[PDB]
Amino acid sequence: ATDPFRAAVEFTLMPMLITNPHLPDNPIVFANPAFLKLTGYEADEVMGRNCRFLQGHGTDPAHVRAIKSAIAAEKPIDIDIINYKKSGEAFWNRLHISPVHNANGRLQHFVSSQLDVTLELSRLVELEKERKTLSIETARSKDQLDYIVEVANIGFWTREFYSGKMTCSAECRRIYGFTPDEPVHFDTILDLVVLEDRMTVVQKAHQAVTGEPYSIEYRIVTRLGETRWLETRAKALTGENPLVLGIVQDVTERK
Amino acid sequence: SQATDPFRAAVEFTLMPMLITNPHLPDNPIVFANPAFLKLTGYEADEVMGRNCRFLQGHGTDPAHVRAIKSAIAAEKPIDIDIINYKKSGEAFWNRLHISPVHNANGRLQHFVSSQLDVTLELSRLVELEKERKTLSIETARSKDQLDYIVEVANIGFWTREFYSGKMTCSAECRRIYGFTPDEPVHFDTILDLVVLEDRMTVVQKAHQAVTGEPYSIEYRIVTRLGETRWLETRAKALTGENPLVLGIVQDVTERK
Ligand SMILES: Cc1cc2nc3c(=O)[nH]c(=O)nc-3n(C[C@H](O)[C@H](O)[C@H](O)COP(=O)(O)O)c2cc1C
Ligand SMILES: Cc1cc2nc3c(=O)[nH]c(=O)nc-3n(C[C@H](O)[C@H](O)[C@H](O)COP(=O)(O)O)c2cc1C
């Protein structure tokens, strides 16, 4: 005849405590295996003492007063406080404390459900401020790039080695017959290339990536019918899915 | 029954969903569910009792996960396993499950107790935070690779300046225009020493006045360390946000008046 609730508290993964308020200083009279494992204390090392022994230097004094006022008022309380393991390792202890009254209405026990939320209040929180930091830097480093190609008027383009997706500057879109807003793929450039230069272009474009800079020159017939001679100095960014960089310029004058 | 059972109360008041089943009854039905469990699933108390815990399951739920629990229960062994379940509304969620067998003194199986936890949006949050960091790491590194490539290949006199501080960065072409050495530290004052005194006041004021994110141009005369007089044009713009940064492109336009 085993008590299923006793066994539930016994076998749960979540730390639980029970204190007897009728004794002085309201000491711990029970601690499930989960609690002893989290804090690293043995059973005989936590019995008989108040739960304030888990506190330390990083423990917010304001958090302690809240718990004190709740216990003195015999009222429940949920709070996140900084506690310490036997080794010294600090951890965020999500505290859920509930008073237990008898039939008459007198206080009989205090029970609590401790939960280690260190990875939420300490790990996730910094990963949110770390990610936000990267966003600024990413947006900035791009703002420098976009500003240079604009005021220096450079036909700058990028190309994904596999998908063939591209980005083009204002100058690059003027060299070809492109509009400032339309999406640009490697195929929309290939459509402008003269018939005789096409095979040379796509073979160089789909050639095995090397971190070395290379030059390539081909002719295009723009969408208005104007034949233009282009020169391009390109370089591939090594990776699993490389990004090809390239600066194109119109050299039709004096071929 | 004057005094309450603290263990009973602990399970009652906890925010962790907990179930108790009686394996002596057919198909091992639920005989208890704390208020925590009823809020998670959205079922009433009388809508859970007498049922097996498989009613939370449905489509998308891996049948391999079920057989793992099935074999664990049959062997009277504890088991930790995540699984897909369905709350009353139909909303699917991930159920972190911790089941433990309860034996008496004789070794006779009496009960099963469990801990339930909703870890759907929890695991989903971190699997997107670790894929987001990888992308932004590559992007920043590559957008930095793009910048240096353009400046070098296109021979641009490009400089950056922390507006408040005054510390500057200079490209190879930028240093050749003013007449700097490729490895000396460059401050805004270092440039001012070369600017002619007639145009010197007009330069500092224009650089000082505009902290906004509005583009502006300025042209002045300088004299290098060797004495060469050069007319310059600088097109600059400051990036508003936290510690400001002034970007500027300068080209030598030594052409006759
Ligand atoms: C059941 C129960 C469990 C408690 N568990 C913790 C705990 O895990 N960590 C902690 O810092 N305080 C815990 N406390 C609160 C402390 O025992 C103590 O009441 C609090 O630090 C204020 O003590 P003070 O009034 O002497 O300053 C718990 C209190 C109760 C009643
Ligand atoms: C105490 C206890 C709690 C359980 N809780 C769940 C649960 O929350 N979700 C679930 O899918 N299965 C849960 N199960 C397992 C199911 O009740 C069922 O035994 C298991 O899915 C295999 O049953 P089947 O092979 O007939 O499909 C629990 C089992 C026990 C003993």
Give B118 Cα–ligand 1 centroid separation in angstroms: 27
Is B206 within the bounds of a domain? yes
- Total structural domains in chain B? 2
The alpha-carbon gap from A8 to the nearest alpha carbon of chain B, in Å, equals 6
Strand B168-170 versus strand A90-101 pairing type: unpaired
Q: Which of B39, B69, B44, B34 is nearest to B54 (CA)?
A: B69
Residue nearest atom 5 in ligand 2 by C-alpha distance: B53
CA angle B217, B221, B222 (to 5 degrees): 120
Residues A169 and A111 in one domain: no
Query: Which chain B residue lies closest to A146 (C-alpha atoms)?
Result: B147
Per the CB < 8 A criterion, the answer to whether A175 and A156 are in contact is no
Give B7 Cα–ligand 1 centroid separation in angstroms: 19
Residues B13 and B115 in one domain: yes
Q: What would the two tokens of residue B211 be?
A: 């902290």
Q: Which among B132, B140, B215 has the least Cβ separation from residue A141?
A: B140
CA distance A41 to A15: 12
CA distance A191 to A183: 14
CA distance A53 to B16: 25
Q: What would the two tokens of residue A49 be?
A: 């003492």
Q: Find the helix or strand (DSSP H, E) in which A229 lies.
A: strand A227-237
Residues of chain A with a following break (C to N over 2.5 Å): none
Domain end call among A75, A100, A122: A122
Beta carbons within 8 Å of A142's beta carbon, 6+ residues apart: B143
Residues B105 and B159 in one domain: no
Is A157 within the bounds of a domain? yes
Per the CB < 8 A criterion, the answer to whether B125 and B136 are in contact is no
Per the CB < 8 A criterion, the answer to whether B122 and A33 are in contact is no
How far is CA B121 from each of CA A211, B95, B124, B125, rounded to the nearest angstrom? 41, 11, 5, 6
Cα of A253 vs its chain's centroid, Å: 51
Residues A159 and A236 in one domain: yes
CB atoms within 10 A of CB A80: 14
CA distance A192 to A228: 10
Residues B10 and B116 in one domain: yes
Residue count (chain A): 255
Contact A143 B239 (CB under 8 A): yes
Give A97 Cα–ligand 1 centroid separation in angstroms: 9
CA distance A53 to A31: 14
DSSP B153: H
Residues B247 and B194 in one domain: yes
Chain B residues closer than 8 Å to A1 by CB: 104, 110
Residues B115 and B164 in one domain: no
Contact A7 B111 (CB under 8 A): yes
Is A109 within the bounds of a domain? yes
Resolution (Å units) = 2.8
Amino acid, single-letter form, for residue A211:
G
Give B96 Cα–ligand 1 centroid separation in angstroms: 29
CA distance A125 to A108: 39
Domain end call among B67, B94, B120: B120
CA angle B51, B97, A18 (to 5 degrees): 95
How far is CA A77 from each of CA A69, A94, A113, A245, B164, rounded to the nearest angstrom? 10, 11, 11, 60, 49
Contact B10 A16 (CB under 8 A): yes
Residues A156 and A237 in one domain: yes
Is B115 within the bounds of a domain? yes
Amino acid, single-letter form, for residue B81:
I
Domain end call among B120, B135, B164: B120
The alpha-carbon gap from B13 to the nearest alpha carbon of chain A, in Å, equals 7
CA distance A172 to A156: 6
Residue B112 Cβ inside 6 Å of ligand 2? The answer reads: yes
CA distance B237 to B214: 6
CA distance A17 to B192: 71
Torsional sign, CA A206, A207, A210, A216: negative
Helices (H), chain A: 4-11, 33-39, 61-72, 118, 125-151, 170-175, 186-190, 198-205
Beta carbons within 8 Å of B177's beta carbon, 6+ residues apart: B157, B230, B232, B250, B251, B252
Is B149 within the bounds of a domain? no
Residue B165: domain span? 154-252
Chain B residues closer than 8 Å to A237 by CB: 142, 145
Across the strands, what pairs with A100? A109
Return the CATH number at A110.
3.30.450.20
A20-59 as b/e: b if 16+ CB within 10 A: ebeeeebebebbbebbbebbebeeeebeeeebeebbeeeb
Residues A109 and A167 in one domain: no
Residues B113 and B20 in one domain: yes
Burial of B221 (0-12, 13-18, 19+ CB in 10 A): middle
Query: Which chain B residue lies closest to A104 (C-alpha atoms)?
Result: B2
CA distance B24 to B33: 18
Contact A8 B18 (CB under 8 A): yes
Q: What would the two tokens of residue A5 be?
A: 């609730």
CA distance B214 to B18: 61
Residues A157 and A243 in one domain: yes
Is A129 within the bounds of a domain? no
Residues B166 and B106 in one domain: no
Query: Which of B149, B174, B177, B239 is the mutation pick for testing A, counting most A CBs within 10 A?
Result: B149
- Detail the DSSP E strand segments found in chain B: 18-21, 30-33, 79-86, 92-103, 109-118, 158-162, 168-170, 216-223, 229-239, 245-252
Is B160 within the bounds of a domain? yes
Is A143 within the bounds of a domain? no
- Contacts of residues B22-29 at CB distance under 8 Å and 24 or more positions apart, as own/partner, are B22/B111, B23/B73, B23/B109, B23/B110, B23/B111, B23/B112, B24/B109, B24/B110, B27/B52, B28/B52, B28/B73, B28/B112
The alpha-carbon gap from B100 to the nearest alpha carbon of chain A, in Å, equals 7
How far is CA A75 from each of CA A37, A235, B211, rounded to the nearest angstrom? 28, 69, 56
Residue with tokens 């107790």, as numbered in its chain: B113
- Contacts of residues A36-45 at CB distance under 8 Å and 24 or more positions apart, as own/partner, are A38/A85, A38/A91, A38/A114, A38/A116, A39/A15, A39/A83, A39/A85, A39/A86, A40/A85, A40/A86, A40/A87, A41/A86, A45/A86
